[PDB]
Structures are given as structure tokens and as C-alpha cells.
Structure 1
Amino acid sequence: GHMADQLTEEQIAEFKEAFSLFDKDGDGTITTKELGTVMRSLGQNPTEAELQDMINEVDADGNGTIDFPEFLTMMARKMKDTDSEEEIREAFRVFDKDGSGYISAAELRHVMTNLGEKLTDEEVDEMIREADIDGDGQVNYEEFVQMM
């Protein structure tokens, strides 16, 4: 069988109830009105245009609303995304061996060396310099997030 079918109908019904947090009239799609409702419940207040722009960047079939599949797709990407931030933070820590919040040439020297590379001091210092944005001689976490 398939793991997806390893639930009960009452359980799928219950899973579907959770969608109603956003899909308040229960019809199976989120409208701009419903999403505006949710936003305003969080203290925000966007326009019809802004609400239609949020919806559009998740609206896979083009019909102007968010069904439960699109929502779950959107959520899964979000969940994988926050994990990718956890691990860029993890990676910053590995480079920043002294936990000072800033990566030195020395610290980048070290990691590069332990990763195989055989670059010069200049080439490594050419990295810190190319990566710096506040000219402080070190690489804070944000200049590090610029590792695209």
C-alpha cells in the first residue's frame, strides 16, 4: 500500500478541519477575504491587491484561491525553508570556531583547509574582503548568509 492511505476517514476529516483555520466558510478554498480575516487576526491589515498578491504566489492552478493541496505545498516549502535557516546558522557556527559572532581570515583559512582546498592567504583574504559589507575585517552572520 501507500503510507498516504494509512489514515482513517475520521482522521482525514480531522486533518481537513485544521484547514478551516484559513478556510472559514468550509468550502475548500481560501479567498482574499478569508486571508484578510486571518491577517487582521494577527494584527496586520493588507489591501485586496496585497491579499491577491500573496494568494497569487501560491495559487498553482491559477483560479484565484488557495485550496488545501496548494496550502499544504506552501507550508511544506516553508517548513523545509526554516530548516535550511537552522542549518545555515549551524554552518556559521562551524566557521566561527571561537563563537565571537564574526568569521576571521584565520577561521576561514582553517575551514577551507579542512575541506580540502589549498588556497593562499591572499585568496582566502580575497574572500573575506569580497564578502565584507561593513568593512570591519570580519564576516558577521549576514555577510555569511550572502553565500549564495
Structure 2
Amino acid sequence: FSEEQTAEFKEAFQLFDRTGDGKILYSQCGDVMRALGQNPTNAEVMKVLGNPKSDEMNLKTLNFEQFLPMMQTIAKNKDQGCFEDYVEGLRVFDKEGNGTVMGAEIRHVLVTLGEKMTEEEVEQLVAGHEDSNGCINYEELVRMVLSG
């Protein structure tokens, strides 16, 4: 793309370097990509990561040179799952349509479906929004995640 935002790109890239030169682990560089708004599933990440294995992902880092075509391929997605998707799917995921969605079921179907995440991930995700009813307003959290 352009050098317009490549300055922020460079400072962020070197910000999370464990060696301080421009070599950042594959897991870490994917995490930075996700932190840069561009948050795709690890599937297409590995697809554009040369289809490596977990060992290579945790041993092999990446320079900033190849990082530009990498976010280029990421920008080729040009879109992700929409907001109406999430709101309607969570609305139809509840048991009674009571403006909210139960918590434990959400945690379970999040850590045990499709892309796997640890329990504390979804825990600190839902953390703060808990209620005595256990039914969190999916709308506020989904719009916070989308906008944030």
C-alpha cells in the first residue's frame, strides 16, 4: 500500500520484538495483525503464512519486509463477518429471546466450537458484563467488540 501509515506500522512492528531488530514470531506477528484492526481467522493466516506447522510458527519469526505483502493478502479479504450476523445469531442462540444470552453456554460454545480459545480468553472477554441472571446483553458486548 502506502507509506502513509507505514510509520505506525513500523513502530508497532518493532514495538513487540523480543530481539529489537525486526524479527517477530509468527504467532506474535499474527497477534499484531489482529491488533491492527485486521483480525482474520488463523486458518487464512497459516494459508498466507506458507502453511507452516505449530513448531515453525513458534520457532520462525518474520522480517518487516515480508510483513507488507502479508498485510496485503490480509487486506484482500476486504471484509469480515458482519454485525447483523452476530446480533441475529446470538439472538437466535438464546433459549427464550429475553434480550440477553446466558453466560456459561456462551463460554462453552466459544471455547468448544470452531476456532479454539482458552477459557480465560472468553472469561476476560465477558468479564465485567456479568449479571446475577447470568444473561448478558449480547448487543452491547458485540458492538463493543466490533467497534473496539
TM-score, normalised relative to structure 1: 0.33
TM-score, normalised relative to structure 2: 0.33
Higher helix share: 1
Larger Rg: 1
Q: Which has the higher contact order (CA 8 A, sep 6+)?
A: 2
